[PDB]
Each structure stands twice: as structure tokens, then as C-alpha cells.
């Protein structure tokens, strides 16, 4: 005889039901907001007749069984794994399940693929009628209970709460089946002491949560200090269920709904330029049908020193019209939904996690989607032979040099913007002609979309 | 990056600059620069009326983007001698103090940096939560305390 | 760089958008319950086809913009005006707009027309498809924002709250247009110090709120001490907006609904004749389809001495 | 901008001029102007019955439009010599003070402005919180503490 | 699985290592290593300015997965002789300590395990509750109470 205490519950996640190992199964540390169960439908048949002394009575029939439900909160904890020397998070199985439906593959380039620099989850390759199937094994005190086949449905990230950043998972399951015998040795499978020691020094503080937001229509970068916000990834999972009447049935299949990387923001009113005031004024005055905003919410902030941070990237994120809020201090809340370049493209957004996130690292992740791959920072234009002037009917195949030297996209575009005195091509061969008595400038734009600019005014005139 | 004593100096020179003979139609009393944040023994005061500023406790709440909400508390004390009547002159003093607290722009408290990088900054709130005075002391002597919760957001973005 | 503090918000109400003057514009003191904004609609289109590897995605379109909303509470402050030597209230354009649709005329005999003895608003001549249009100019700290065309939809008066009697206005607006430059000198337009001085000695206390009620059919006067009560003037304003799909639109017009001077009362049971028990007994026993009761709510009580009251 | 002692003076003078024998059919006693805004000591008092108007703290509230609510506590003490019995006399006097504080208009205090001009002013309302008797005192010397919180609004300021 | 003295040692050594003149453009003073984990008596102390790190109560919470949140309170005291003026000097020192406590990484303390081996460890976060000044003390000798609640999580245990 004993009682079961919630303090003694361990939540495991495994992609299979047998041959459990440290790779196909894993433990995830949960929080006190843990809840699960499986309710049932019921139909009551009664009769209504006009005869004196009616038939007051009813009978209840158990018809079916609603798909199980469940939800727990786990702290985002990037850390380096000694076995592979690559950044990972304890609940990477969960991220993989939320992302794709193919077999987990950390080395790949889609879904829950980690990198030496950082661990990233990519929402491409999530077009599947059923996402990856998990079987949650719940150990409490000593009793065993597991959920047959569940698919993650929601992942909520709330930052306003001052505590360390947390993620609230949720989903559904076919049938909460109690287990009479242990499936595997918990101590061996569960996270060992050393991993816990490594993890605890990598918590993420919401006390430092800088945000980057830029209107890709106007190419204007706003400087916004958040006061609260959140973003949820919803799959709108629905569970098909048979409808046999004679016997009680179970939901057998699932149909993933519509992807929704919905989120929200809120901040105080700041009159300084490129602040919340400026965004408010722009969005209310312009009044466009659709918007294209690149939103980057950076939990844990960024620093020159290496420090942990969790990163959300939502390229071309749709933004709703801000709504002013009135309280002791005025504030405005902006609700946004990440829309893709194309409906089936699946590039709504991607995330980054690592304990060693650096400002350069974070920016390259934002503009490339991977920490390891770098991005161009500063660009200057170097003329062929270092010439600051050119005469008519002469060609100047001016070259270019980027920074840093490790940028992946050394290639940039060419454009002549100010004046009409020379013509340049993709090769960079700038050409002039007769009757060109005005100075011209040559502009370049990086092919990686980093947003670097390089200017040079060449005095092309009538010559000698 | 507290700037607590910077706030105290802001108060002392605010009171000093204001409440002068330049604007008598608006404020009652003149102090001729007789105001200081330094507290002294009551017997030690040289001349009256005199006003002193105390730096109280300074609570703080953090915000997600590094914003800090410091609710610094500045007790204000005034001492005066019963030359005509303790109550009336004390009333005039407290009313002038309240007027200077409310009327006009916010605090302009200087921020001093380690590399002599001094630039100005300002609070957001100034509320006199409660006004009270001491009674039963030496009839010539009088005392009134003002509780000002200057709420200021430090220029955290500098760090 | 600065932060806007709600403590530093002043509300102005003007019958026009230009040529602002003390007569066609004014400030109304607002209590801590102040709120405004303008939310928007949104339609999300998604797809569903049975093919393997479906198309999981959606796109959001901004269709239109719901008419702005707003609400603030102002104390009822009758007072005599030195200029005209007639009773008035600070927010008299508000009452005028809640009453009529014709141009404000204080000396008239309908709507917000004052009298030497008292300022009284008459709800006759409120038959109008659109009541008098007000534009709410909102100043906070230093930013400037105003609502294009507002029509008051509700004026709720609650007495049960022990504090001084207050009125909770509420309306709607086409579009919340922020302003970059000041529209007029606030100090000149806003209520001056002397007017505030005169007004503050005119507050009305709900501590003395006598009520008179008489059954016209039976001609019987009931003596009822209230414990709480409310009454609201509702115009049920509905805002009409186009339904263009390609371009985002704005509510252009408005239709006034049905006038509703609804109210409520509450009191203790009192066995003394012509008390609450007598009224309750009469109403329950008689059980008529319709009634005709002349109800008068006297906030601030009445007295032989001259004193304020609404 | 404050008027604390101004409020106390207004209340004390109201007590004075609304306690003479001009209203014997409404009020009980007649203090004969034995009302003051400050007392040196209970022992120091000589003539009874004597009512003392004290000055308490003053809580403050700030409203959006630049308004300003100020709640001022006005503890009022009374004393009486046992001519017949302390309890009844203190009851009569407290009834008189409650009538003075609940009938009539509003607290009319004069605010002396710095320019040197005084303007009539009026408080909003005067609500009492509780009445307390400090029993157990010297039998011939009674005491009844009646507590009031006058609610007054100062001249508009603090715009910025 | 307690590290109280360990946490205090980490804080004191952070103060020492991050107070030298190596960062004159980021910090004001230079304690020259006059930082200690315990003090016998204010009177006992001899050299100023001096900062004392104290040890307080250690509240704890229990979480479902066997985790363990435990909040440690770290009152910090400072002192200084009035070389120019107590208030300004204490403000300088307190701002410096706030910079030391808010910037940088996490509190790195070394836990000595029973086996005899020492492992590096890191606290989760460090939040200051309030900074208070004990005014009215001896004029040449000032004091500023700065209270901190270090949030640290011990090695995982209590599985059963």
C-alpha cells in the first residue's frame, strides 16, 4: 500500500515500443504544469410518452473514447554533448516530432538537425498527413502508464513571465494504456548525473530578450524593447474516429491540420525614432492589405561573450494592425502570423538553440538560417587598378571585396543608381560611352540578402 | 548604474533653483539656497526654514528586454521655528514643496560615467503618496515629512 | 526618448476639425477608467486535399477595420458661468451629442440647452439617422491622436458605488488617426485654473440620493430609500462598413439604433406604508400587462438650502 | 498646493459658529467658542467641555486629467468635566459634532495664495470613519475620539 | 547537495577578480581584494572601503521530474570612510557592485564532492531584490544594504 506523489513522476518519450535504447528513447524533465488523461463520450436514451403514469427512466451507453490529451512544460536547455561535441537540447525528440514526420536524423538539413555551432529545428519537410509518432511513457512513483501513439499539437513559448523561458507542449493520444511491468531500466535510460550537471549551467533567462524586427517592404529596422510576448506553433491536429454503435471504439488515425506559427508582442510607447511610436504610426497610416516583416525574437539576448540563447526566425512574417493598450504606462501589442513564400514551401520559420550564441553567430543564423555558415558584414568596392576616375569610351571592370573572408556568398549584384554615365553588367565590367558629362555611382547588393551596401562615386567626364 | 545619489542631487538643486525670489507669486517661501540632501542632527541646524532629503529603500523589478523598474523612495523633511505660527508656515512650506514636485518638467538627474561620460537623464513618475507632520515636539520646532516615490527607468541600454 | 504616462492624458472634444476655439472645442476631465483603440478583422485561407504529403500552410489577409471604440468617466459638475451667468456642466457637448443631431444651441428649448436656473438636456428632437458628430482629440504626454467621427452610444450612471456620482460615456469611431503636429494651443483651449476652482465646489455626493416614484394609474407616492441603482441611455448605434475584398476599407457611415433609457433600482424591504414592501405587494398582486410609473432619481438629494443635484 | 491647516481652521471655525445658541432646537450644547486647532496638553486645558481638532496624515491619489484626490484625516478629540455623568455628556457632544459634520453644506476653507490674495474654496465631502471612546481615564475627565477623513481636491496643477 | 558557502565564495571571488584596475572604463573603484565572506564586527574592520558578503536563509522548491529549485538569499554589505562624502562614495560603490552582479555570465562556484574531486558549476540567475541604505549611522562610516537572491539548482537527486 502506498500513494503516488506528483513529485515522483518522470516523463519519457520513445519513438518505438520495444528495444528501448538511449537513442530511440529519452527522458524529458517536466514542470509542475503536467496533466494527462482520457475522457469518454456517452449517450443517454430516454422515452417520452403521453400515457398516464409515464415511463420515467433512462439508460446510459458507453459509445466511444475521446483521444487522450496531455501537456507538460520543459525548459529550453541547449548544451554540447561530449559524445558528438555538437549542440543539442534534452527534448530534441519532441522538437523533431513537432517538426517533421520522417525518421529523426540529427545530421540532416531539415527538421531537428543539429550543428556543431548550434541545434536548429527546420519546419520544412513537415508536409505529412501524420507527423512523427511518439509513445509517451509516464513513470510515477512505481506505476507505469503510457500513451500509444501521440502527435504534438502545440508548443507555446511565453516570455512575459519573469521566470526562465519555458515551452508548453501539448498533444493527443489514442489510448492511455496502463502498464503492469516496467518497460526498461529507468536509471540507465534516464539522463545521468553528469548530463544534468552540464545542463544546469545553460538555462535561459528571459531577463535578456532582445527583439529584431524589420519591414522588408521599407527596409527599416525598428528598435523595440519588449515587455511581454509569446509565439505558439500549432498543427491543428484532428483525430478521426470510427462510429460503430454496438461496441465501444477508439480513435485510430490522425489528420494534421494547418500550420500556424502564430505569435504576439507587446511593448511600451517610445518616442525615439525607429521605436514603438514609429512602428505604430507606420502600420496605422499605411493600412496595407498584406505585410512582409522579418521578425526575430531572441530569448536570452546576444553578447560578444559566448552565452546561451534560443532564437525564433519568421521570415516574411505577416503582422496585424497594432492595438494601443491603456494602463499605468501606455503599451501597444502587435500580433503576427508567419506566412510562407509559397503555401507548400513550408519555410514559415526556423529556430536556433545553443549555449555559445555570439552576436556574429546570431546574425549569420538570422540571415542564413544556420549558425555555422557565415554572412557578409561589410562591403567596399575596389576598382580595377584602384582608379577614381574614367574617361569616355573606356571600360572599368571594377572588382569587390567582402568581409569577413569566411562569408559563404562572396557573390554580389551590380547596379548603377545615381547618374547616367556608364553601364555595368553581372561580370562587373563597367562601360562608358560618348556624351557622358555626369559623375556616376555603382551600387552592389549581396546575394545572401544580408543587407550590406557599398558606394563609390566615379568622376566620369569628357576626358582630356 | 543606480544614480540614487544623482537623483538626490537632482532634488536638492531642483528645490534650490525653484522656490526663489524670481517667482514669489507662485511659491511662498524663499530659502536662499538653504537646502541639502545631507542629514544633520536637529540641534545642529543653523537657520530656519531648512529642508533635508533622505534616500530611502529602492525596490526593483526586471523586465524581459533588460528594462528595469526601480521605485526609489525619497523622504523629504522640513524644519522651521515658530516665528509667527508653526502650523501656518509649515503649511506654506509643504505646499511650496508639493508645487515644485508637481509643476514643471520631470526630474533632470545627471548620470555620471566612469570615463567622465556625463549626460542627462530623466525619471517618469513623481507622486507624493502621503504627507504627514510630527506633533508634540518643542512648540518652537516643527517637522513635516513628505513621501515621494520617484519611479525611474535607468538607461539600461547603455550597460 | 520618453515614455507616455496615462497620468498625463487630456481629452478634448470638438464639433469640427479646424478653427478650434473655446466655443467649438473643449477639454473634459477623465477618470482612471479610460480606454480606446481600433481592432481589425482578419481572414485566413487554407487548403485541404487528400493527396499524400498535403499542403500544410495558410496566408492571412487584412480585410477591413472595425470602427474604433472608447469610453471614459467624468464627474457631473454643474456650475454657474461668469460669462453667461447660467448653469452649465463641463462636458456639455457630450450631452448635446448624446441628445440631438442638430447644431448645438444652448439657448434653445431642446437637447443640451441650459437655463439660468439650471442646465437641462431634453431628449426630444433626437430623431436622426446620425447624432451630432464629435471628434475626440486625445493628448497624452506629448503625442497627439484623434478619432475621426464619434457618436456617443451609452451613458451609464451608477449610484451604488459610494464615491461621488460619475457617468461612463462610450461610443465608436471610424478610424483612429494619429497626429504628428499639435492642432491647437492646449492651455488656451483647455479649462483654465479659475474654472477648475469654481467647479471643484460643485461635486455631488451619492451619500444623499433620494428617489421619488408614483404610480400614475393609482396616484400613490412610494417613500423608498435606495441602496443602489443605475440608469443608462443607449442609442444602440450600429456602424455600417463596405465589403470590398481587394482593398482594406473603413466603416464610413452609422445608423442610430433604438433609444433605451433603461434603468434599475434596489432597496431594502420596509413594512412602513408606502414603502418597498407596499410597492412589491402591489406590483406582484396587480399583475398588469403595462404600467405607467413616474420615476425621478434625485442624485445629491434636495434641501431647503441651495445645493447641487442632478 | 496644500491646504491642510486651512482645512482644519475651516472645520474649527464651522464648529465655533454653528454651536452658539442660535440653534437650540437643533443642537444640544453651546461650546461658547471653546474650540481650537491645537492643544498643548490635556492637563494644560482649563475650561470644559473642550473639543480639539487635530491634523493627521494626508493620503494622495493621481487621476489622468491632472486632477488630484487628497484624503486628509481629521481626528477630533472632545473632553468634558463630569457635571452629571461623563457618558451621557460625551454622547450629547458627539451627537452635536456629528450633526455639525453631516448637516449643512461643504467645508468652506479659505486658501491664501502666494500673491497675497485669499479665495473661498469648498471641500468635496466629509465622511466619518469611526467614533471611539478612551474609557478608563480619570473619572471627572472624559474623552471621545471621533475620526473623520475630509476629502478635498486642490487647485488643478501637475499638467506636465 | 548544498553549496551555500560555495556560492558565497563564488560571489566573493567574482567581486575580487572583477574589481582590479583591469577595467577602469567599466568600474569606478578598486577594492584591491578587500572582499571577504565573513566579518567579525563592524568595529573590528580596519581598512575601507570594505564589502561583506553574508549568508541568509535558503528556501527550496520541489519539481515533478526530480529537479530542485532552491533560492539562496545573499545580503551584501558595504562600508566606507568619508574621504569626500559618504553618500556619493556609497553610490559609486553600489553602482559598481550592481554592474558586477548584472553583467557577465553566471555565478561560477566550485562544488567539492565527497569523493574529493571538485567540479565547476554555474548558478542559474542572480536577481537583486532591493538596495537599502542604513542612514543615521556614524557620519564618517556609511553603510548600504544590497539584497540579492541567487537562484541555483543542485545536482539532480531525490529520485525516489
Residue numbers in the entry:
A (entry chain H): 1 to 464
B (entry chain D): 1 to 159
C (entry chain I): 1 to 310
D (entry chain E), E (entry chain C): 1 to 160
What does the paper say about this structure?
Using electron cryo-microscopy (cryo-EM) and single particle analysis, we determined the organization of the tail proximal extremity of siphophage T5 that possesses a long flexible tail and solved the structure of its tail terminator protein p142 (TrP142). In siphophages, functional tails are produced after capping of the tail tube by the tail terminator proteins (TrP), of which siphophage λ gpU is the prototype. TrPp142 is resolved as a hexameric ring, interacting with the last tail tube protein TTPpb6 ring. TrPp142 is a 161-residues protein, mainly formed by a four-strand antiparallel β-sheet that lines the lumen of the tube, flanked by two α-helices, and a short loop between β-strands 1 and 2.
We also imaged T5 tails after interaction with E. coli receptor FhuA reconstituted into nanodiscs (Tail-FhuA) with cryo-EM. Image analysis yielded a second 3D map for the proximal extremity of Tail-FhuA, at an average resolution of 4 Å allowing us to build pseudo-atomic models for TrPp142 and TTPpb6. At the resolution of our maps, no conformational change was observed in TrPp142 monomers or hexamer (rmsd 0.43 Å over 156 residues between Tail and Tail-FhuA individual monomers), and neither in TTPpb6. For the latter, it was already shown that the T5 tail tube, formed of a stack of TTPpb6 trimeric rings, does not undergo any conformational changes upon interaction with FhuA and that the signal of the infection is not transmitted from the receptor to the capsid through the tube itself. Because TMPpb2 is expelled during the infection process, the lumen of the tube is empty in Tail-FhuA, which constitutes the only difference between the two EM maps of the tail proximal extremity. By also determining the structure of the T5 tail proximal extremity after interaction with T5 bacterial receptor FhuA, we showed that no conformational changes occur in TrPp142 and confirmed that the infection signal transduction is not carried by the tube itself. TrPs homologous proteins from myophages or tail-like machines also show no conformational change upon infection.
